[PDB]
């Protein structure tokens, strides 16, 4: 049936096209029908459109057969027919509705082409037309990217639609124009990017944070290859410029993801402006503990941008952050006691009784205790327990025990330019080989990303880089490599490449040289690449096959080419294919190591397709291991959305049913994939049940270690519970398993520490931080690295670590005690409102304190409001007209 | 012991305007699911591994025979004979064969017995009868604390009870206070008790068991207490775990002198539930959550401080909580600019979360009546008295 | 099987007859044309009974 009372619509808008010949009646009926359609679809919130539903059926024959109309006038009546036929587009026509757009609305523009459209709120030619020009235009770009003018007039039409989408309604539809910009212009996306930039930057300023968040979350999951990930990376750069507020430290973030492009984007994002450096631009430098070479390329060479050109550089290098860490430990926040290993190793009261002695000073447990004590008091100058008096304690191990005990002793004074040197001067003249190597490593360990102007490591180790002793070479090169983790200065290259190309050393030395050098640089450094390839050629097959150190050679090349896309990996795979089948392993390393955040299908598709399942019956060792371990490389933190179902991937598909020798230990991936401490998500089920399952030895040892992931500041409660439940009561008899249990589950006490690659903002990783990959391959090998004490320096190579604290200052010091709000993250930003990152207060700590990644803070009482809006542990409380 | 359960997929729920950020994230999830499917189909494509021992396993299977009945090991004797109860309820003094794991034999664990001449021939650690398997949550409910409006004190209390001991508990033994073993939510119907349980089951790291209370009662003699025992044994086995018993008053009513056999069995089932609640130490990582509307009708022994210390109150929402719930449920609606929603809240009534959800649904229905989807304020105006059915006027003024 | 207890066939899902009888297998003969008044009531029912089922998209 029908309404009856409003049965005029099924008549007049029915006969008017039915009667359609005479041109005056045609023009009159077309004009009247345009007026009716406008009056209906313009203001009436009713989604139903009376004429649209009543134009159907008859429209598909009348408005389609009257489409020619023979053009009695020049264009006017044809324009009227097109304006009519552009009304019943959605339902009346087929899925080639974009075809209706082409020959109705594209071929001609009724003066203002959106005369009956721009007035409509969202439906008639804004959402619908947007769909049409992101489907048809995308396909035409895919096949005929340079088409006729039907590719450019549609471009201006789409640009006008996009800008109107912000200024026709001024509503949350602002989350559509960039989105359209993404789907539209599939090949020439940059033109759409400039269009939306010139629109938004001049349109309105608070509607820019939505643009940044949209671009950020589309960056997290872009299309598969970095041809538009880079473009959308570059899109918000004008939106960061003076077109928005000037401070906007986001430039670093927005330059860190695009292959950490320092010398191409940093030159103008913050180096060009240099007008408000007295503001949080100074902490923008301070929150840039990734690319010290960037500060070298501007501050030291010029020294005239501002007075605080080099004092700022030194203080934000380590010295003032180290002093802040110390004072945070002592002066105001007092959890700085003397914490040795024994004070909590026997934290279980079962271990008191039934021991019947059981006190053995053997190398393994003494080594484990030294490692634990070194880790717990990391960057603490207060560990006067196993440092001065216990020199015989340094002695009560085997040969490698000397090395590792001295290494831990150095680790105690992490990045201590003065204290570390004045405490290693005593052990420098150790009068013993292994302790001497440990002292070299300790000299290189107080230089973790230090970038000291005096450069003590290079001169102090150049004597032993090539000296005729394998352990001297190992210690010196490891220490210097840990010293030059970020920068890739030519001096260390010219010093180490001859060592790297030397043939006196065994390939344990060659591999650690490769690790150190490839960890020095994160760019190209083709000399290192050439050395790696020639070494892979000049060595004989058994050496590169079964020496238990060949894995390190491709790792250096990968770490050199980490972050950068396949542009270099193509030629790397081309050149590496000419080697022994071990190169396959190298292949499955180097390629997959080139990406830090590259959440995509095809890369992991190959990882899971040709390298996972085409190897299940294959007995090629250590080939699947890197595959499944670096499945989480290029996936560590794509806003962590990619991490959960990856966890499902390995736990369900890999751990449960995988190869007992190449996939059963799919667990240090959990070490790298996600690490905060999460029951049934990262540790409890997936690691605990495998750890109790000591059926496979290497699985047990490795996943007992794997808690080193969550271990940075795990709030050891419910994690130390595991240790007490398995120390003595678990794998006590197994010497190696107990040793690694002690190491992992007892180096949790290290306070205010964080090893994860993801930075404080979270949208950018840390290539320097990602260099903690060598103690993943090496920790998986377990032969001559961990289970066998062939080389324990990798277990010290965890100088890819940042203080997990939160501290605030105002151009002077930490004296600001503004009330803070640290709590679980929630939905925010891109939704209807940027709701506070903390849903509530939780802990109301005002003093500077710990801030783990699953914790964020918000400023209080609108007092001394920070402008960083990133809170990279170095908040600056620049005041304003608070309480207006 | 084993580990917890209740695997869930990505939260997603960061965008909702369907702005292809949703599409990109969902496409990533779908790509990972595709790699799941392809990887396991390949692994089953090539996986030759079988036989090996064969002969010894074949002869042990011949010794076991076919079929093998499962029973409950009620008691043990000298380490060759035991007492095992068939599912019927009859238990026998049977022998124990050599190939059984003498360490695994404990009172309660299911034992595989020989069909003829009953004798313990195996141990099953995963009996988990279909009912109790059903009560274990597999797919986490889509609701979460974001969906809960107000009840901030209630959320705080429930997290301090069931989450803080699960996460870092050092505060508890540091103060020396034993963790709160069990929590009872209560309040008028449709305040959000079951919704809070759903949200807990979402943001969880432990095996969540949903129970109905009335589900526990079973027709056959001793089936009730046996099922309760099985539920709590599964809770301990998959500890840490949370056992949610909705509508506890289905059995929690005041205990009275039973007369008929059925009421005696109900008393037995509740006695077994109370005994199981007492059985595990509060230091254990298994917690219970019981929700009810008629709190006043519960037995005043179930809510003893020695059994259930906490008592979470779910009062009718306040005006600010009412507007919070309205904002939450109107998030997916395309409301117009004329709507204010303040008049409905300001009206002194007894709206609940369920009432507000129904008001939003009915407002949407009224808008659909007018062929629109923008939902005016008049739609809410009508819907409020549409769904709110049922002091003598000027007596109080 | 007989007493070997061997799974030899898969049968439809278990529904005991007490509820299996509650299907309306024989539809009744009562139309809205046989209902006087109640037009508003019929519409209100239909908005909950089959409108959600026929088209949940709205």
């Amino acid at each position: 049936m029908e309404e009856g009372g409003r049965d005029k619509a099924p008549v007049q808008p029915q006969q008017s096209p039915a009667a359609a010949e005479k041109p005056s009646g045609k023009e009159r009926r077309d004009a009247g029908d345009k007026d009716k359609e406008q009056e209906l679809s313009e203001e009436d919130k009713q989604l139903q459109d009376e004429l649209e539903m009543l134009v159907e059926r008859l429209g598909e024959k009348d408005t389609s057969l009257y489409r020619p109309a023979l053009e009695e006038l020049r264009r006017q009546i044809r324009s009227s027919t097109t304006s009519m036929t552009s009304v019943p587009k959605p339902l009346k026509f087929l899925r080639p509705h974009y075809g209706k757009l082409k020959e109705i609305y594209e071929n001609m523009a009724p003066g203002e082409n959106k005369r009956f459209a721009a007035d409509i709120i969202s439906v008639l030619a804004m959402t619908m037309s947007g769909e049409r020009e992101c489907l048809k235009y995308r396909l035409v770009g895919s096949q005929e990217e340079l088409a006729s003018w039907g590719h450019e007039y549609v471009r201006h039409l789409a640009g006008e639609v996009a800008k109107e989408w912000q200024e026709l309604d001024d509503a949350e539809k602002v989350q559509r124009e960039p989105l359209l910009t993404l789907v539209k212009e599939i090949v020439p996306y940059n033109m759409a990017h400039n269009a939306e930039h010139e629109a938004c930057d001049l349109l309105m300023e608070i509607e820019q944070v939505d643009m940044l968040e949209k671009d950020i979350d589309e960056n997290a999951y872009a299309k598969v290859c970095l041809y538009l990930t880079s473009c959308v990376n570059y899109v918000p750069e004008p939106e960061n410029s003076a077109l928005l507020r000037c401070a906007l430290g986001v430039f670093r973030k927005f330059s860190r993801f695009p292959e950490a492009l320092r010398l191409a984007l940093m030159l103008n994002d913050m180096e060009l402006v240099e007008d408000i450096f007295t503001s949080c631009k100074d902490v923008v430098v301070q929150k840039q503990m990734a690319f010290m070479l960037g500060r070298h390329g501007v501050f030291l060479e010029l020294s005239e941008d501002v007075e605080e050109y080099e004092d700022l550089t030194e203080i934000m290098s380590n010295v003032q952050l180290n002093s802040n860490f110390l004072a945070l430990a002592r002066e105001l926040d007092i959890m700085e006691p003397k914490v040795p290993d024994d004070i909590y190793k026997t934290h279980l009261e079962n271990n008191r009784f039934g021991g019947s002695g059981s006190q053995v000073d053997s190398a393994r447990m003494n080594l484990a205790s030294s490692f634990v004590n070194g880790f717990v008091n990391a960057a603490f100058g207060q560990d006067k327990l196993l440092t001065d008096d216990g020199n015989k304690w340094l002695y009560k191990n085997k040969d490698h025990g000397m090395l590792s005990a001295a290494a831990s002793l150095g680790m105690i004074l992490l990045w201590d330019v003065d204290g570390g040197l004045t405490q290693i001067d005593k052990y420098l003249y150790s009068s013993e080989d292994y302790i001497k190597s440990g002292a070299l490593l300790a000299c290189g360990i107080v230089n973790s990303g230090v970038r000291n102007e005096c450069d003590p490591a290079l001169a102090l180790l150049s004597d032993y880089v090539l000296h005729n002793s394998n352990t001297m070479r190992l210690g010196s090169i490891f220490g210097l490599g840990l010293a030059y983790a970020g920068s890739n200065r030519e001096d260390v290259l010219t010093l180490l490449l001859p060592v790297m190309g030397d043939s006196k050393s065994s390939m344990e030395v060659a591999g650690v040289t490769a690790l150190a050098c490839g960890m020095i640089a994160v760019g190209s450094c083709n000399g290192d690449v050439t050395s790696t390839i020639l070494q892979t050629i000049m060595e004989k097959s058994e050496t590169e096959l079964k020496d238990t150190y060949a894995r390190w050679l491709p790792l250096g090349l990968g770490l050199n080419h980490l972050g950068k896309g396949e542009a270099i990996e193509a030629i790397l795979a081309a050149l590496e294919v000419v080697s022994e089948p071990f190169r396959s392993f190298a292949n499955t390393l180097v390629d997959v190591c080139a990406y830090a955040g590259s959440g995509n299908v095809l890369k992991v598709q190959q990882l899971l397709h040709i390298c996972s399942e085409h190897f299940d019956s294959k007995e090629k060792e250590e080939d699947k291991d890197k595959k499944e371990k670096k499945d989480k490389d290029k996936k560590e933190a794509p806003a962590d959305m990619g991490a959960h179902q990856g966890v499902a991937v390995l736990g369900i598909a890999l751990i449960a049913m995988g190869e007992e020798i190449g996939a059963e230990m799919a667990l240090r991936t959990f070490g790298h994939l996600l690490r905060y401490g999460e029951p049934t998500l990262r540790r409890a089920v997936p690691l605990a049940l495998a750890l109790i399952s000591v059926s496979n030895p290497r699985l047990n040892i490795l996943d007992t270690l794997s808690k080193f992931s969550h271990d940075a500041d795990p709030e050891v409660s419910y994690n130390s519970i595991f240790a007490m439940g398995m120390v003595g009561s678990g794998t006590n008899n197994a010497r190696l398993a107990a040793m690694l249990r002690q190491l992992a589950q007892y180096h949790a006490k290290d306070p205010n520490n964080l090893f994860m690659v993801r930075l404080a903002q979270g949208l950018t990783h840390l290539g320097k931080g990602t260099l903690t990959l060598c103690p993943y391959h090496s920790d998986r090998q377990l032969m001559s690295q961990v289970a066998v004490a062939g080389l324990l320096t990798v277990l010290v190579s965890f100088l890819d670590v940042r203080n997990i604290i939160l501290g605030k200052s105002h151009y002077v010091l930490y004296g600001l005690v503004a009330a803070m709000q640290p709590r679980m993250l929630v939905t925010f930003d891109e939704e209807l409102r940027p709701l506070p990152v903390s849903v509530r207060v939780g802990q109301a700590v005002d003093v500077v304190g710990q801030a783990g990644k699953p914790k964020t803070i918000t400023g209080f009482q609108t007092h001394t409001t920070p402008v960083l809006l990133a809170h990279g542990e170095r908040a600056e409380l620049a005041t304003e007209e608070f309480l207006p | 012991t084993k580990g917890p359960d209740a695997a869930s997929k990505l939260p997603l729920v960061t965008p909702h305007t369907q702005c292809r950020l949703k599409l990109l994230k969902l496409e990533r999830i779908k790509d990972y699911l595709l790699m799941e499917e392809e990887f396991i189909r390949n692994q089953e494509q090539m996986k030759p591994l079988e036989e090996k021992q064969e002969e010894e396993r074949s002869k042990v299977d011949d010794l076991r025979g076919t079929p093998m009945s499962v029973g409950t090991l009620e008691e043990i004797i000298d380490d060759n004979h035991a007492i095992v109860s068939t599912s019927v309820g009859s238990e026998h003094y049977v022998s124990i064969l050599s190939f059984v794991d003498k360490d695994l034999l404990e009172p309660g664990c299911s034992v595989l017995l020989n069909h003829k001449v009953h004798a313990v021939i195996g141990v099953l650690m995963d009996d988990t009868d279909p009912l109790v398997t059903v009560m274990k949550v597999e797919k986490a409910p889509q609701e979460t604390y974001a969906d809960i409006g107000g009840l901030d004190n209630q959320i705080q209390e429930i997290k301090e009870s069931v989450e803080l001991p699960l996460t870092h508990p050092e505060y508890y033994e540091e103060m020396g206070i034993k963790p709160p073993k069990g929590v009872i939510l209560y309040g008028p119907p449709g305040t959000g008790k079951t919704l809070l349980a759903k949200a807990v089951a979402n943001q969880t790291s432990a095996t969540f068991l949903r129970v109905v209370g009335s589900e526990l009662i079973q027709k056959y003699l001793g089936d009730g207490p046996k099922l309760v025992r099985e539920l709590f044994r599964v809770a301990e086995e998959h500890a840490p775990s949370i056992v949610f018993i909705d509508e506890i008053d289905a059995i929690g009513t005041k205990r009275y002198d039973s007369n008929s056999g059925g009421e005696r069995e109900i008393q037995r089932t509740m006695l077994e539930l109370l005994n199981q609640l007492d059985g595990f130490d509060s230091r254990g990582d298994v917690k219970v959550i019981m929700a009810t509307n008629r709190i006043e009708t519960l037995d005043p022994a179930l809510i003893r401080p020695g059994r259930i210390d906490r008592k979470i109150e779910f009062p009718l929402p306040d005006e600010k909580t009412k507007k919070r719930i309205f904002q939450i449920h109107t998030s997916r609606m395309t409301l117009a600019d004329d709507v204010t929603l303040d008049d409905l809240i300001m009206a002194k009534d007894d709206l609940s979360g369920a009432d507000i959800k129904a008001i939003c649904t009915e407002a949407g229905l009224m808008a659909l009546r007018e062929r629109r989807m923008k939902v005016t304020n008049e739609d809410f105006k009508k819907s409020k008295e549409n769904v709110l059915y049922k002091t003598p006027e000027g007596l109080y003024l | 099987r007989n007493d070997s207890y061997t799974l030899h066939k898969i049968l439809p899902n278990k529904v005991d007859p007490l509820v299996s009888l509650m299907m309306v297998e024989k539809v009744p003969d009562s139309t809205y044309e046989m209902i006087g008044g109640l037009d508003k009531q019929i519409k209100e029912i239909k908005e909950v009974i089959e409108l959600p089922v026929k088209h949940p998209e709205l």
Partner: peptide, 30 residues
């Protein structure tokens, strides 16, 4: 006032017009 039950054309137009352009793709993907 007697309210009109939605007709077939009404239902068909309701599912379209006032829809997000990505309705089909998102629902299908889910």
């Amino acid at each position: 006032k007697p309210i009109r039950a939605l007709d077939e054309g009404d239902i068909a137009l309701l599912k379209t017009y006032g829809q997000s352009t990505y309705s089909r793709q998102i629902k299908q993907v889910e």
